[PDB]
Amino acid sequence: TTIKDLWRVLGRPVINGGFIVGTTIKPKLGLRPQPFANACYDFWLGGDFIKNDEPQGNQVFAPFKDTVRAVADAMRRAQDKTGEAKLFSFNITADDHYEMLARGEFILETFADNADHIAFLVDGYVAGPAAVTTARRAFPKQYLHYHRAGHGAVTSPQSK
Amino acid sequence: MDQSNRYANLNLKESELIAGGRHVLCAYIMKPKAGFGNFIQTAAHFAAESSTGTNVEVSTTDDFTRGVDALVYEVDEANSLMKIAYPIELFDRNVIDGRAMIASFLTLTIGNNQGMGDVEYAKMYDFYVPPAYLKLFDGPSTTIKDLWRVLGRPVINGGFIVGTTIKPKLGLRPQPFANACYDFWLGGDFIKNDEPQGNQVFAPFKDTVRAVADAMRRAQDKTGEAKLFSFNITADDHYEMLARGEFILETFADNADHIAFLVDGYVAGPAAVTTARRAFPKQYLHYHRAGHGAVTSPQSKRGYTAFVLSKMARLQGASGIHTGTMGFGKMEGEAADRAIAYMITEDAADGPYFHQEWLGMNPTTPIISGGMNALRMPGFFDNLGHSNLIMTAGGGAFGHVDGGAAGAKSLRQAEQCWKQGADPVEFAKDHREFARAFESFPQDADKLYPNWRAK
Amino acid sequence: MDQSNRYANLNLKESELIAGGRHVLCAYIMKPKAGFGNFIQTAAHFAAESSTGTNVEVSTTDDFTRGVDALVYEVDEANSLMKIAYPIELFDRNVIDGRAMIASFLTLTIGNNQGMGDVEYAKMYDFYVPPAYLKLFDGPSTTIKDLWRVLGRPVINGGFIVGTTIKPKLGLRPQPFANACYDFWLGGDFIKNDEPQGNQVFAPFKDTVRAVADAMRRAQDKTGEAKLFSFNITADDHYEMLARGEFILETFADNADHIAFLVDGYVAGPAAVTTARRAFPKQYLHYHRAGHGAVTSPQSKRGYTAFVLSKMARLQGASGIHTGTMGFGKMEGEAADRAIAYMITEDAADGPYFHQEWLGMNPTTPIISGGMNALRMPGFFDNLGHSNLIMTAGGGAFGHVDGGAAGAKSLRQAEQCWKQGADPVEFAKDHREFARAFESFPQDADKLYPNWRAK
Ligand SMILES: O=C(O)[C@@](O)(COP(=O)(O)O)[C@H](O)[C@H](O)COP(=O)(O)O
Numbered sequence A: 001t002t003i004k005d006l007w008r009v010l011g012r013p014v015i016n017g018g019f020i021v022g023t024t025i026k027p028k029l030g031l032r033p034q035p036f037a038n039a040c041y042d043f044w045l046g047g048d049f050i051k052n053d054e055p056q057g058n059q060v061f062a063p064f065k066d067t068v069r070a071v072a073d074a075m076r077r078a079q080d081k082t083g084e085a086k087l088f089s090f091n092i093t094a095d096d097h098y099e100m101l102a103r104g105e106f107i108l109e110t111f112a113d114n115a116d117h118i119a120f121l122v123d124g125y126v127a128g129p130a131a132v133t134t135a136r137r138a139f140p141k142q143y144l145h146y147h148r149a150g151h152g153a154v155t156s157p158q159s160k
Numbered sequence B, C: 001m002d003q004s005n006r007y008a009n010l011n012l013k014e015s016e017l018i019a020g021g022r023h024v025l026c027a028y029i030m031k032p033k034a035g036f037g038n039f040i041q042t043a044a045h046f047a048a049e050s051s052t053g054t055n056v057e058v059s060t061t062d063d064f065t066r067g068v069d070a071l072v073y074e075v076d077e078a079n080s081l082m083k084i085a086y087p088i089e090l091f092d093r094n095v096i097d098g099r100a101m102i103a104s105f106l107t108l109t110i111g112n113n114q115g116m117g118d119v120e121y122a123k124m125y126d127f128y129v130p131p132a133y134l135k136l137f138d139g140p141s142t143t144i145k146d147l148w149r150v151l152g153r154p155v156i157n158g159g160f161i162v163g164t165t166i167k168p169k170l171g172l173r174p175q176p177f178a179n180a181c182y183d184f185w186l187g188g189d190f191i192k193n194d195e196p197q198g199n200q201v202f203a204p205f206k207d208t209v210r211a212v213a214d215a216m217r218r219a220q221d222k223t224g225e226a227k228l229f230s231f232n233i234t235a236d237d238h239y240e241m242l243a244r245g246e247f248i249l250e251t252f253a254d255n256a257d258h259i260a261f262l263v264d265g266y267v268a269g270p271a272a273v274t275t276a277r278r279a280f281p282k283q284y285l286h287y288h289r290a291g292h293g294a295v296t297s298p299q300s301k302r303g304y305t306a307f308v309l310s311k312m313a314r315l316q317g318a319s320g321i322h323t324g325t326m327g328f329g330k331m332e333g334e335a336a337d338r339a340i341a342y343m344i345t346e347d348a349a350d351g352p353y354f355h356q357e358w359l360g361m362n363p364t365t366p367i368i369s370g371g372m373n374a375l376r377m378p379g380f381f382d383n384l385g386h387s388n389l390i391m392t393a394g395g396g397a398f399g400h401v402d403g404g405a406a407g408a409k410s411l412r413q414a415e416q417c418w419k420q421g422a423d424p425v426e427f428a429k430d431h432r433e434f435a436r437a438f439e440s441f442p443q444d445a446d447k448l449y450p451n452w453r454a455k
């Protein structure tokens, strides 16, 4: 999957479809499910793309399924309001391969006719190539968002 | 009962329906049966039985239902033409991934309406899919580009892939089968299972696959060239399809990307094609269409055309599909079928009724097969205009007087001749295998190149 | 070119081929295209392209291949009849369980031969399967018997199942849909999804299943009788079919054995039917055949007949398949189609050309649908000879002047009328719901019972 598949969903030209306006939901952690979805709604009124901050997942104060449901609702309300398509990149990073599947499958089922508006984010450096490949091979039809948190430990020029 | 007031609106503009992007348009050649309704009444009933209605009024109908009625927006009784617009909301979607299914498109647009007692016949010649519906289809994940890469050819316009079908269609035991594979590969690139070849009692699946894997390695070592095979994994049982595919990929090991998977999509159905498409997206999906002639034939006035079948196949995710020899081979076909090739390869193309933008959806390769040989190829390429495709000649190769290997080279040389724009008879003078194709099929040479006995 | 020497042996006796039990026999109505070979030459080539050969001689052919050739063993040009014997060794088998697949049968017996350029048309009217091949097919695992048991009827000859299809075909949102279900169930037994109903954006699958499950519980409490529903689980993607099937069974819980699974077997293909058959063998498999008319119609001279389709469906494992209204409804059909019902229900039955022993393979129910109502039912039953079947009337029930519940009862009473051998008009005097069907469909009542308004 490429930006082209994101351009197509947005109704942009598939060749040089241009700039995708995005944000990361902040606070990095701490927003409970509905406050999270409200911020998503607010940004989508002016922007295209929203990613989970890299650690956001299934924290005790923001349960995964409740948060996904609220975000799906926010997407529908924002698209109804603006008349334009909106995208979200969900973090499905996990140690357990089957947890990654369970997260991805629930998201795609929840979003339903907006399923192709969904990207899957993987913390590829800390979880490893194995996590990246899990998402790549299980969900090839969903835009695979490689997040590289932790990479700086080696990639920094300070490192030799 | 007359349902034209509800299911017909000829004041609708086709250009506005397209621009709106909320409708699938279908163009039919339909004729009402005598002793029922007139053209519009029948067309209206047709639309109803294909969307929201039945043959009588029901109390359960509400205003929301009426909003999604399929509408007859254009008719031309003189040419028996009928055009229907389907609100895209009608078509079924997967619960698991929100994507489209061609089975739904088929059920509504060409299902029960094919059995209506008040219709004599009705055939779909074209359909239009808008972006919002188009982007929900799988589309091809693998293309000829990936075959070109394995062969070491340029990934852009990598050219002609010389192929064949193993003959006998059935009867070769595992090693005789593999020996035929080895022989052809000495001169050619591509080999497919004949469509019924699988796990016959006299040619067990695993033994045949093993022998062919060995044959591939021996041919690649001998020639120093990469070789391809398209294995039939068609089955009723989804898990049989997986088991066959998985064994093939494991057996071939480091040659696993040399493997294509063949599916008899028309008789086994869209479900079988999708099984292969979704389970093995990294393997070239070879859509074989055996049985299609029952409806696509011009002799038939029912079902859908070969154009329609090919266009559906692209949405389904076929890496390549058989498009026929366009009148140059043994099967029914027309030169005008070139338009079928263009519709499945280009990003923008014209159908008989609708222009289609594919929005960067991957192309489907035209696979040329059916009584082709070296002599018939130049004419075929002239009509199509390019050779960026797969062509197979079973009889044309193994029926070569000098054997399968020579047969393969005759196909290679035949395309080189067309590419060079040379005269076939003159070209043959400096190309033995191609020249020997004249003697292999003298009846063809006599008809195609009168007074060829120059040699 | 001329292959009659190899692929034709008219000295073969059909009785010995049958007694031999080593051949699948197929009967075609074929016409050669003008300007090619005669009948036997064309039939021979037909056999070649359907078994071991191609349109030319190949060097790879050995004596073993010659042994499994399909043979033309009978011809009658005057009647355009052609009979071919296929050695059962030709047909593909599963690696995983050694069982048969109908895809192979289709690919060989009615695949590529439907596109041959030298053939004008060819249609299969009958086929024979010998024991050695017959026993390798799944057959039905669930039958009407399992529905009768749920209803509390005798498991042998449990009688008529009063059914309907929910109309509008599409457009009812979840709760209006469930309301229509509840209403009909007050008078009827069985409800099926209209064939395209699934997971439309305005009627999400899981919400609809939930609403229908609630409707079933409410209707059963109210009536004190068991109620059945047949859900469409058709999809391109095998896993989409499973996801739908599993959710339904879990949702209905202690009513799970009240559930049938409907599959559009013709457009989705044999692969889809088999997915449901093998994944849910304990759930009634409802084979819906939308699209079939494109080949089975007598207007078509290609493909195969409805008889052939039905016979295959029994092998495939269909619990029931639509067999049509046999001329009494809105779809194309003839009274002689009664023979189709007999072939799929009995252990021994005659086809147009072949007698078939089924060796105790489970029966397939004749499912009657298409423009039926209370008024049309007696005539239909007279021609068939029994009412041990499922009949649905969508428009016939929800088009009833007093609503779905009254519609349901009118169908019940219509069958009660026929079984009692009473005169419909006289019977109506003491059965209001049935009498009100006359007023619901006055054009039907006028022809079927001319002076019904007098009384
Ligand atoms: O069985 C055959 O006849 C072929 O292997 C061709 O063999 P030859 O090369 O020996 O003729 C192909 O399956 C047909 O061409 C299919 O037809 P289409 O491509 O029209 O669907």
Ligand SMILES: O=C(O)[C@@](O)(COP(=O)(O)O)[C@H](O)[C@H](O)COP(=O)(O)O
Pocket (backbone or CB within 6 Å): B049, B054, B055, B112, B115, C165, C167, C169, C194, C195, C289, C290, C322, C323, C324, C325, C330, C331, C367, C368, C369, C370, C371, C372, C392, C393, C394, C395, C396
């Ligand atoms: O969509 C329909 O028309 C039906 O639900 C009948 O509705 P009605 O009762 O309102 O006519 C059935 O699918 C057809 O009968 C199929 O034909 P067949 O059984 O011949 O395959």
Ligand SMILES: [Mg+2]
Pocket (backbone or CB within 6 Å): A024, A052, A053, A054
């Ligand atoms: Mg971050």
Ligand SMILES: [Mg+2]
Pocket (backbone or CB within 6 Å): B165, B193, B194, B195
């Ligand atoms: Mg073939």
Ligand SMILES: [Mg+2]
Pocket (backbone or CB within 6 Å): B112, C165, C194, C195
């Ligand atoms: Mg129906």
